[PDB]
Nucleic acid binder design. Structure first.
Lengths: 368, 227, 255
DNA sequence: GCTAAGCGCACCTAATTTCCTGACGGCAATCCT
RNA sequence: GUGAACCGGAUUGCCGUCAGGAAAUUAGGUGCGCUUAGCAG
């Protein structure tokens, strides 16, 4: 069972993702230029969201020695931590390591701070590194890491470390043609001079686009990554939905405060993943009546209708929920009165999704 | 009456492995090999691998062969990885294939008329999935698009067929590579040192051996014989 | 008789197949660089599908050491010029440190294209290794049709969720194996009044109409979204708007 | 149930070329020795 | 079924977060749509 989240979101003039040159990320889809927001950007924005404060339990850092030393008021053990990390298979303050936070803190404190040998200490810390996957963040994003076999001692053996991701996020492509724009700026000098010129001259780049965002959560894999704690998986699904709905990429937000919420969310439950990106192969051209968001929602509804009347199996009918704030933007605005469970509240949508996965209530997670 | 059978080999990707490709690196030849076309007609017949060994090789080895190249395709490389079988261990075969991209070839085989007629009839009704050297290279144009006919010499056959331009103003190939079988004539007349060698005549695959063959190269130019 | 399946699938910006350097698999055709998904990639995408798991199983459909598997698949040739792109990425350290930036700061390669997929499965040999089980042969042909319709390569999919389904599938029963890659010798240039998928389907229709005018074929598009010829003349045998009835029509035509 | 025609102008003069930033992080594979 | 039959480059990743094109300006000058008529035995 897959939880598919399709969102239609329009953003104010902003630069939420740029390359080395500072221009907003773009891609070609359907032969035309499209504005693009990278998948890992949305993944991190959901990751560091205010709604994931109760589920952020994994850390991706290269200065693990600093983290270990931080949990010691006076027990100065930092050179030993670096040495044991280096002998574990890292080589410099190292390569990126992804695993839990409290687990590594407690286990490193009880292992590497004890006066004992070295090689087996490296083995124990390696086992702790591999076995620290009890984090919803790792369960969603997944991880893998294989230390170099040259620097690592032959006395250190690694168990299986590949964590299969339960979340698939697509790159947010614009539903219409991309129009990059140049914002030419100056930097005023406060002290008057003999020239009366700016302290700096430059060109900023920004773009405003209606993005189609696609998320896909594998319920079975999310449960497997968290083992029998299925309630934790339900909480993770709900928190991910809330974060994706209410959190935006933290790009040049101080200069471009584009904090717009999506105008339509389609949560669909099927056993196979479907991307509705082909709904917008033809760029959406705005006309006198209606708007860009309305036309994008109409095109998406048309494509969903053709998909349902196309690839359809009577054995496992696909159900779905449509969300629009206070029913502002309907899906089947003109003829498609097929969705009988249109919702005009995000919390009601979360409750409906949780009920469909199982006997899960949003308040039921307040028991641990 | 028809002595020559014409085969059209055209597609986006094609690959005719040459004799100097036996390692994990597998390159391709500029022109289709005799082994490849022999395998194509063998598949068209539908005869099995073991049926060739039962006194069948010389009934097809005597077919005189000639290859015409219309456009020279540039050599394109594909990185192929094989997981083979996945007690168990991480064993991934390393391979690199060479493919001819945007190339078209014309193969003419000369023989007694009845065999050519039967070959064309069986080509029109292929009992097995035919390809262009590898199973992943299907024919983009019909193999039997050009029908068999009575032509005295291979040069006349090659010059008789007109060249069809894709559009009005395109760069035509001023150089036309060609491959023709070396005629032994009477007894003797050994091939010169300038005649190239090619190992594409299969007789058996245990041990795998291919008899060498001699290939000579010719020129055909349009606009010099027709006003 | 031969069953030939042609698909026109437009994919979202993704990295479905990769070389050693990380670039998307590429090809040259018509004087234009073109994106490519390898045939073995599509074949492996067909295998290991949960849709079928839920004679000798795993032997007749794919041989294992002859078997001489009857299903063949061509390389996925894009209809237009390949447009590779740079994905500049960094991996954050999300801790307060003396420096900034922690990841490999690489440059991922990706491209989006509308691929022409060619599948040719011969009924005779698939019957041959099925011991004459015509019903089972038709069942496995239908299962493979469903898989190829609703499966995608398991490439860099967690960051590039490209699960788009084909907008047009055409099944013909001609005697000789003809691939329609030459329909796209001229690369498709998108115009303001049309889209890439519609133009590609139109080029395929033009190629199908040509040559022959100077056999029959089933055309499937989801809910008849892209019609292969908007006329009442004898151009397409049946216009099918649903996949399951397309498989049913193929099945009772074969048997 | 349906009247037409003549006539429609020229342009001088179009400002000011280095006011423009720095830094940190960029494999892990060695897929019959 | 002829360098061909068995054949995925598989996974992890926000550039993030500095910024007034400003101090100059009258399109100012020229001009008759104008000659013809019963909505009535």
């Amino acid at each position: 069972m897959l939880i598919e989240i399709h969102m239609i979101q329009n953003h104010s003039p902003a630069n939420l993702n740029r390359d080395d040159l500072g221009a907003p990320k773009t891609c070609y889809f359907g032969g035309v230029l499209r504005s693009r927001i990278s998948s890992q950007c949305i993944k991190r924005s959901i990751r560091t969201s205010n709604d994931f404060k109760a589920l952020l339990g994994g850390v991706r850092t290269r200065r693990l020695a600093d983290l270990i030393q931080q949990e010691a008021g006076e027990t100065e053990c930092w050179k030993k931590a670096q040495e044991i990390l280096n002998k574990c298979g890292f080589k410099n303050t190292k390569m990126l390591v992804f695993m839990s936070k409290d687990k590594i803190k407690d286990l490193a404190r009880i292992v590497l701070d004890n006066s004992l040998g070295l090689t087996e200490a490296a083995q124990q810390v390696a086992n702790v590194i591999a076995q620290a996957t009890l984090a919803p963040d790792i369960a969603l994003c997944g991880r893998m890491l294989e230390p170099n076999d040259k620097d690592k001692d032959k006395k250190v053996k690694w168990s299986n470390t590949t964590v299969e991701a339960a979340l698939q996020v697509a790159h947010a492509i614009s539903t219409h043609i991309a129009r990059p724009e140049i914002d030419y700026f100056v930097a005023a000098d406060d002290v008057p001079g003999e020239d009366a010129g700016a302290g700096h001259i430059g060109e900023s780049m920004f773009a405003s686009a209606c993005f189609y965002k696609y998320f896909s959560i594998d319920w079975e894999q999310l449960v497997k990554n968290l083992k029998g704690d299925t309630n934790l998986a339900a909480h993770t699904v709900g928190a991910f939905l809330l974060a994706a709905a209410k959190t935006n990429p933290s790009g040049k937000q101080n200069s471009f405060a584009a904090h717009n919420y999506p105008d339509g969310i389609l949560v669909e439950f099927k056993n196979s993943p479907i991307s509705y990106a082909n709904a917008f192969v033809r760029p959406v051209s705005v006309v006198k009546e209606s708007d860009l968001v309305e036309q994008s929602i109409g095109q998406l509804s048309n494509y969903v209708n053709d998909i349902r009347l196309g690839y359809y199996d009577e054995q496992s009918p696909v159900i779905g929920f449509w969300f629009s704030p206070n029913n502002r933007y309907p899906l089947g605005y003109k003829h498609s009165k097929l969705a009988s469970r249109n919702i005009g509240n995000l919390n009601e949508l979360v409750g409906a999704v949780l009920d469909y996965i199982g006997g899960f209530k949003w308040e039921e997670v307040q028991k641990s | 009456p028809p002595n020559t059978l014409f085969l059209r080999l055209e597609g986006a990707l094609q690959s005719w492995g040459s004799n100097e490709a036996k390692f994990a690196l597998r390159r391709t030849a500029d022109a289709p090999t005799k082994s490849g076309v022999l395998g194509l007609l063998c598949a068209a017949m539908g005869i099995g691998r073991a049926e060739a060994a039962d006194s069948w090789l010389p009934k097809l080895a005597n077919l005189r062969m000639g290859v015409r190249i219309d456009r020279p395709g540039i050599r394109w490389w594909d990185f192929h990885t094989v997981g083979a079988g996945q007690k168990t261990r991480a064993e991934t075969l390393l391979s690199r294939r060479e493919y001819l991209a945007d190339a078209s070839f014309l193969v003419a085989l000369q023989g007694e008329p009845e065999l050519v007629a039967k070959l064309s009839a069986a080509l029109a009704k292929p009992v097995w999935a035919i390809y262009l050297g590898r199973k992943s290279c299907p024919p983009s144009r019909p193999v039997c698009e050009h029908p068999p006919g009575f032509y005295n010499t291979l040069e006349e056959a090659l010059s008789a067929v007109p060249l069809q331009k894709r559009w009005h103003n395109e760069p035509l190939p001023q150089i036309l590579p060609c491959v023709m079988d070396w005629i032994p004539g009477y007894d003797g007349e050994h091939a010169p040192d300038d005649a190239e060698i090619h190992y594409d005549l299969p007789v058996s695959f245990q041990p795998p051996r291919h008899l060498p063959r001699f290939v000579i190269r010719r020129e055909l130019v349009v606009g010099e014989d027709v006003q």
